[PDB]
């Protein structure tokens, strides 16, 4: 029977995003990102570009390798978040459960925006 659990992790800064196809232990099968193509900078963070990244992930995971259940886990919030999450449906990926757990602020309070990140 399909035991079916396999996390994908999206490592986000406001400036840019990349997807790492991790797993339940967290070792990566593969990773891919945009910037081999034309748009660079905060145009990656952009929602249209984010879709392109997301599908590139998913396609390896299902059909070729053949895990089916998956958690999406993200790190702090971008504009891209809605686009990534929506496109998981059109990846033909079945969310086993979805839990985001970006890392909480806990008073890592120092001037250089150490705190400034987090959630």
């Amino acid at each position: 029977i399909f035991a079916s659990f396999n996390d994908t992790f999206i490592h986000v800064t406001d400036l840019s995003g990349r997807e790492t196809l991790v797993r339940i232990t967290g070792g990566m099968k593969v990773k891919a990102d945009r910037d081999e193509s034309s748009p660079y900078a905060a145009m990656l963070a952009s929602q249209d570009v984010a879709q392109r990244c997301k599908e590139l992930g998913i396609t390896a995971l299902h059909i070729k390798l053949r895990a089916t259940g998956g958690n999406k886990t993200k790190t702090p919030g971008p504009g891209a978040q809605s686009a990534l999450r929506a496109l998981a449906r059109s990846g033909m990926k079945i969310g086993r459960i979805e839990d985001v757990t970006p890392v909480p602020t806990d008073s890592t309070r120092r001037k250089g925006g150490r705190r400034g990140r987090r959630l």
Partner: protein
């Protein structure tokens, strides 16, 4: 990616600059064969329930 279905209803403007009259794209769902989310481009404000032809769409 993206199919190509007749028409398209704008679900709601995902933001932009704006205030009054919304220059930049909007997120649309196809009017029939629902639940395909893409960003299609408009000039001007737009409302949900609006009908616009997205001929080739993509």
């Amino acid at each position: 990616m993206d199919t190509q279905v007749k028409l398209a209803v704008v679900v709601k403007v995902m933001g932009r600059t704006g205030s009054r009259g919304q220059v930049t794209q909007v997120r649309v769902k196809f009017l029939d064969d629902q639940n395909r989310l893409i960003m299609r481009n408009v000039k001007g404000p737009v409302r949900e329930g609006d009908i616009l032809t997205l001929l080739e769409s993509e």
